[PDB]
Design a protein around this motif. Structure first.
Motif, short mmCIF file in Angstrom:
data_model
loop_
_atom_site.label_atom_id
_atom_site.label_comp_id
_atom_site.label_asym_id
_atom_site.label_seq_id
_atom_site.Cartn_x
_atom_site.Cartn_y
_atom_site.Cartn_z
N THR A 327 0.83 -1.19 0.00
CA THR A 327 0.00 0.00 0.00
C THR A 327 0.88 1.27 0.00
N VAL A 328 2.03 1.27 0.69
CA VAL A 328 2.96 2.41 0.58
C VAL A 328 3.44 2.55 -0.87
N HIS A 329 3.75 1.44 -1.53
CA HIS A 329 4.17 1.49 -2.95
C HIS A 329 3.04 2.09 -3.80
N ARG A 330 1.79 1.67 -3.56
CA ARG A 330 0.68 2.25 -4.31
C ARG A 330 0.50 3.74 -4.03
N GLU A 331 0.69 4.14 -2.78
CA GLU A 331 0.63 5.51 -2.33
C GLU A 331 1.73 6.34 -3.00
N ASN A 332 2.92 5.78 -3.07
CA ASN A 332 4.01 6.50 -3.74
C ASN A 332 3.77 6.67 -5.25
N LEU A 333 3.29 5.63 -5.94
CA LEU A 333 2.94 5.79 -7.38
C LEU A 333 1.95 6.92 -7.55
N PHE A 334 0.97 6.94 -6.66
CA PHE A 334 -0.08 7.96 -6.67
C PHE A 334 0.48 9.35 -6.44
N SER A 335 1.25 9.51 -5.39
CA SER A 335 1.76 10.83 -5.07
C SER A 335 2.74 11.31 -6.11
N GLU A 336 3.54 10.41 -6.67
CA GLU A 336 4.42 10.84 -7.77
C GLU A 336 3.61 11.37 -8.96
N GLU A 337 2.52 10.69 -9.29
CA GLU A 337 1.68 11.14 -10.40
C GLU A 337 0.93 12.45 -10.09
N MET A 338 0.50 12.63 -8.84
CA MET A 338 -0.28 13.83 -8.50
C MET A 338 0.57 15.08 -8.36
N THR A 339 1.78 14.90 -7.86
CA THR A 339 2.61 16.08 -7.59
C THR A 339 3.41 16.49 -8.82
N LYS A 340 3.76 15.53 -9.67
CA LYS A 340 4.57 15.78 -10.87
C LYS A 340 5.86 16.53 -10.53
N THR A 341 6.35 16.27 -9.37
CA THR A 341 7.64 16.85 -9.05
C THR A 341 8.77 15.73 -8.55
N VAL A 342 9.96 15.86 -9.12
CA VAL A 342 10.93 14.81 -8.82
C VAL A 342 11.24 14.72 -7.33
N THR A 343 10.95 15.77 -6.57
CA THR A 343 11.32 15.73 -5.16
C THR A 343 10.42 14.75 -4.38
N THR A 344 9.28 14.31 -4.94
CA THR A 344 8.45 13.32 -4.26
C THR A 344 9.22 11.99 -4.07
N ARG A 345 9.73 11.44 -5.17
CA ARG A 345 10.56 10.22 -5.08
C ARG A 345 11.79 10.49 -4.25
N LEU A 346 12.45 11.64 -4.46
CA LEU A 346 13.66 11.90 -3.66
C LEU A 346 13.36 11.94 -2.16
N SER A 347 12.22 12.50 -1.78
CA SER A 347 11.89 12.57 -0.36
C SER A 347 11.70 11.18 0.28
N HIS A 348 11.17 10.23 -0.49
CA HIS A 348 11.02 8.84 -0.05
C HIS A 348 12.38 8.19 0.16
N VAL A 349 13.27 8.41 -0.80
CA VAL A 349 14.60 7.83 -0.72
C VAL A 349 15.36 8.43 0.49
N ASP A 350 15.22 9.74 0.67
CA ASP A 350 15.91 10.48 1.73
C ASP A 350 15.49 9.91 3.10
N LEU A 351 14.20 9.62 3.23
CA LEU A 351 13.68 9.03 4.46
C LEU A 351 14.22 7.62 4.64
N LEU A 352 14.15 6.81 3.59
CA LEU A 352 14.62 5.42 3.70
C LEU A 352 16.09 5.36 4.14
N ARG A 353 16.95 6.12 3.44
CA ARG A 353 18.38 5.98 3.68
C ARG A 353 18.84 6.62 4.96
N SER A 354 18.00 7.45 5.57
CA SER A 354 18.36 7.95 6.89
C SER A 354 17.70 7.07 7.97
N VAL A 355 16.39 7.18 8.09
CA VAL A 355 15.67 6.49 9.16
C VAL A 355 15.68 4.97 9.05
N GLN A 356 15.36 4.44 7.86
CA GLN A 356 15.27 2.99 7.77
C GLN A 356 16.66 2.32 7.75
#
Ligand SMILES: O=C(CC1CCCCC1)N[C@@H](C(=O)NO)c1ccc(-c2cc(F)c(F)c(F)c2)cc1
Ligand SMILES: [Mg+2]
Ligand SMILES: [Mg+2]
Ligand SMILES: [Mg+2]
Ligand SMILES: [Mg+2]
Ligand SMILES: [Zn+2]
Length: 889
Positions: A327-356
């Protein structure tokens, strides 16, 4: 404590076919009557009938309308109701009970509880047993018929799952509503809400079946003006599942409800999604910009659960990542399509590589499908969610969109209406994989290691180019460090999305290519490569790994300027920064250790600084991306690369690097801060809540990032800009004016001004609290004491407590004060909070997760506070289990 093991899964000896509930809410107590129509399953072996039931006061219990007698026929120990097998029928029977529960004093916010003047439930994972007796596990699917009664003046709106089939008046100022939900569901998806709720509504017509769906969004009356964006987001969510996945909503009505007191973000109860108000409510006058992406994300997430979690549900809780990662993957596909800005995917990666990544190298490291648990509340982690999402996303990378959609539909069609497991999903993806490869011998058996293997893989590279042969090779290696879950780590199936950039003209030299690394190492060779390329590796961050690109900073600069992939550009920048941080950190560390009277620091690469200037000055470049390149990597990301990390020395390292870059670029920053104003702060649509411009918000992020850099730098007369910024209508701006004023004598003037602007909106006040908490102030301990005395006081609202303390814990210099006073403060808050909310107390432990990565003195100080917390006689199960795992006991 009872340890549950994945391998021990076995179906129940019982079946629950029908639940019929009467929930009668009174002033001092709530009375719950329940009839369970039950049966004996094929797995039954004459066992006692044991129900979960936690904290229930028994009025009576019966089987087939015969009252059972305590001691002789049943025992209850406040956790389990045991009916001795000799009194359990051998065919279909009715179990009934009446219990008393107390939502007013349920401050743990699990089960049935009161949030301000709203009665609300939270049953995932094992909270239904706090409402009534049940076999409380997700494979016990049943039909629900629920009646709620309450005082009509206090609670005029009554909601539960399914269709409202009756409304009726009751003597003494009461009323009731009956809800019948015939489709089977697990009990963790049950919900009830009672309150003086106000709403906005709309009708959505589905794409194919043309079904009319009623959409309702609810809040308390005070905040009904903040409901519009959520309703828009819900419409967008429905359309996206229709458009990308071909999936329509199946029910007549969907309700979203905001409550003020909530442990996490929101919950996907079927037809009745319940939200932390901070993840549903916004308005442009009373919310910072981040609220808009947050509400989009969280409304989308709960909506996408209707298929991935609600229609296809879980066999058992070890499969959690099957619904949450997917469901997070589905949410990310959705938000990437709605925002149309590259920083959406980058913000996910930034969170993963720090917190996770921090979690995955900590003593808490686990795979996305753990082998055991004690606390289910502690099972919900960034590993299960965010690494789970990246594992679900790799299937799309591997298959491509067309075959991914084919595989996803196979999963849905085969498992709709049933429980499922991680294997079921891998099976569906494998069928698509065979199709794509045109090879029924192809399989994804190796892929299952992503579910079972903990730790972050490391992927490294070596290159070779033969000019005469026009032949290029990429030599790739993978390694996962052994940990407490696997002594020997197997190679994973790692998809490496790659491009080859021609350094002379910046163009693509090959078509879209995904390397499938399936061995510990492999060499990928490319022919007809006319010039030595610069490789663009792991485009889109194509696997959740530590990337060691083995590129020079010259090569990384070329990618940063000219590559086509936003992540590889961002990562190349990240990698230049990291090389600089590690070098300067070591230089400062040596000077400290050796008590040097003088020493040298390696300056920041001048060509790197020139490249930042180049991108900043490009008017066609993206503002969100610009804000990332002038920001150093997150502290939590940096700490993964340093042993015995001295936080003081890291703070000095960051300071030096920011000052180096600012001494060259501040005039550029200032010029941009001014030229961006007109578009960034445009008020044309300020009173239209349907109109959200993610590019404009990224322009404000850039303006606020620059203003922070310029304020720290004491850029001449920048206080003028700060004071004017405090007058902006946008809370993102006027709250920024408070935090950047920390460096000036006007700080408490802006503290008072912004407090007055924030105090009359609950959620805005929490954002003001966060801003104060994160302020770069020498007197931050004194300020925190003032917040405690004047604003926070003894609030039990998790949003208040998290707002006051969590941002401060990210203050590298002050939270990690070598006295240990910051560690002492947060541990006192954890222990205090644990008395009434163990789940939130465990959240407040977050800064301790890196304890064994710090310098020896700070390790000792943190460990002392964790041992102190562990010795509290009244410690919760959650907090005890968590701290015992974190401290390696
Ligand atoms: O808010 C989040 C993100 C999650 C929060 C915990 C750390 C990992 C990230 N997740 C939702 C969710 O998946 N909604 O669809 C969520 C997470 C945990 C719970 C939850 C709440 C409880 F009160 C509880 F006791 C529990 F065991 C789980 C409910 C919802
Ligand atoms: Mg009780
Ligand atoms: Mg449409
Ligand atoms: Mg409050
Ligand atoms: Mg351990
Ligand atoms: Zn979820």
């Amino acid at each position: 404590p009872k340890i549950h093991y994945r391998k021990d899964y076995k179906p129940s000896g019982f079946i629950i076919n029908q639940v019929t509930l009467n929930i009668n809410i009174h002033d001092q107590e709530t009375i719950v009557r329940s009839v369970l129509d039950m049966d004996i399953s094929k797995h039954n072996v004459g066992e006692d009938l044991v129900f979960d039931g936690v904290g229930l006061k028994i009025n009576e219990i019966s089987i087939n309308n015969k009252k059972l007698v305590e001691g002789e026929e049943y025992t209850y120990d406040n956790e389990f109701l045991t009916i001795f097998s000799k009194f359990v029928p051998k065919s279909k029977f009715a179990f009934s009970s009446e219990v008393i529960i107390h939502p007013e004093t349920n401050y743990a916010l699990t089960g049935l509880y009161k949030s301000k003047n709203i009665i609300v439930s939270q049953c995932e994972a094992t909270g239904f047993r706090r409402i009534t007796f049940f076999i409380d596990r997700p494979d016990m699917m049943a039909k629900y018929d629920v009646t709620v009664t309450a005082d009509k003046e206090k609670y005029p709106v009554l909601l539960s799952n399914g269709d409202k089939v009756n409304e009726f008046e009751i003597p003494g100022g009461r009323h009731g509503a009956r809800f019948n939900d015939p489709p089977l569901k697990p009990c963790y998806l049950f919900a009830v809400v009672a309150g003086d709720l106000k709403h906005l509504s709309a009708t959505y017509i589905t794409k194919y079946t043309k079904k009319k769906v009623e959409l309702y969004v609810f809040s308390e009356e005070k905040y009904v003006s903040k409901l519009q964006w959520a309703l828009e987001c819900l419409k967008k969510s429905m359309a996206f599942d229709e458009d990308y996945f071909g999936l329509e909503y199946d029910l007549s009505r969907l309700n979203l409800v905001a409550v003020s007191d909530f442990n996490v973000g929101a919950m996907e109860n079927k037809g009745l999604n319940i939200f932390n108000a901070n993840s549903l409510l916004a308005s442009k006058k009373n919310s910072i910009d981040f609220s808009y992406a947050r509400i989009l994300t969280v409304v989308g997430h709960e909506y996408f659960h209707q298929y991935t979690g609600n229609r296809v549900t879980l066999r058992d809780w070890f499969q959690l990542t099957l619904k949450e990662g997917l469901t997070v993957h589905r949410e990310n596909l959705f938000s990437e399509e709605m925002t149309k800005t590259v920083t959406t995917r980058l913000s996910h990666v930034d969170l993963l590589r720090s917190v996770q990544f921090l979690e995955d190298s900590s003593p808490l490291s686990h795979p996305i499908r753990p082998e055991s648990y004690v606390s289910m509340e502690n099972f919900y982690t960034t590993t299960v969610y965010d690494k789970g999402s990246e594992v679900m996303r790799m299937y799309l990378t591997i298959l491509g969109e067309e075959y991914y959609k084919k595989g996803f539909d196979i999963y849905i069609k085969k498992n709709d209406g049933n429980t499922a497991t991680c294997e079921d999903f891998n099976y569906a993806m494998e069928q698509a994989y065979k199709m794509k490869k045109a090879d029924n011998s192809a399989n994804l058996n190796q892929y299952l290691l992503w579910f079972s293997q903990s730790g972050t893989p490391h992927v490294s590279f070596k290159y070779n180019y033969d000019a005469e042969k026009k032949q290029y090779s990429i030599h790739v290696n993978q390694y996962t460090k052994p940990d407490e879950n696997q002594k020997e780590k197997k190679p994973l199936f790692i998809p490496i999305s790659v491009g080859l950039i021609n350094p002379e003209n910046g163009k693509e030299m090959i078509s879209q290519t995904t390397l499938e690394l399936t061995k510990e190492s492999d060499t990928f060779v490319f022919n007809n490569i006319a010039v030595k390329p610069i490789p663009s590796l792991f485009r889109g961050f194509s696997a959740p790994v530590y990337i060691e690109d083995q590129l020079t900073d010259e090569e990384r600069i070329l990618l940063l300027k000219y590559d086509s992939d936003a992540f590889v550009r961002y990562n190349s920048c990240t990698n230049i920064y990291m090389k600089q941080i590690l070098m300067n950190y070591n230089e400062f560390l040596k000077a400290k250790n050796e008590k040097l009277e003088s020493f040298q620091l390696t300056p920041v690469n001048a060509q790197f600084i020139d490249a930042i200037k180049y991108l900043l000055e490009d008017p066609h470049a993206d503002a969100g991306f610009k804000s990332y390149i002038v920001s150093l990597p997150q502290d939590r990301y940096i700490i993964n690369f340093v042993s015995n990390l001295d936080t003081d020395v890291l703070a000095d390292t960051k300071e030096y690097i920011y000052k180096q870059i600012g001494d060259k670029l501040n005039d550029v920053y200032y010029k941009m801060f001014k030229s961006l104003e007109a578009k960034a702060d445009d008020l044309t649509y300020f009173n239209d809540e349907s109109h959200v411009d993610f590019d404009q918000m990224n322009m404000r992020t850039l303006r606020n990032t620059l203003l922070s850099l310029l304020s720290k730098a004491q850029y001449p007369n920048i206080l003028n800009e700060i004071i004017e910024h405090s007058k902006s209508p946008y809370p993102s701006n006027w709250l920024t004016s408070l935090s950047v004023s920390a460096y000036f004598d006007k700080y408490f003037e802006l503290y008072d001004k912004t407090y007055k602007l924030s105090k009359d909106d609950e959620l805005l006040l929490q954002e003001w609290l966060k801003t104060v908490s994160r302020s770069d102030r020498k007197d931050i301990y004194e300020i925190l004491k003032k917040l405690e005395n004047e604003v926070l006081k003894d609030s039990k609202n998790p949003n208040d407590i998290r707002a006051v303390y969590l941002p401060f814990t990210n203050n590298l210099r002050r939270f990690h004060d070598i006295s240990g006073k910051g560690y002492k403060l947060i541990a006192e808050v954890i222990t205090k909070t644990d008395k009434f909310n163990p789940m939130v107390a465990t959240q407040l432990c977050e800064p301790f997760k890196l304890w064994n990565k710090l310098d020896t003195k700070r390790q000792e100080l943190m460990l002392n506070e964790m041992n102190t917390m562990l010795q509290e006689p009244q410690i919760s199960n959650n907090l005890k289990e968590y701290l015992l795992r974190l401290t390696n006991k």
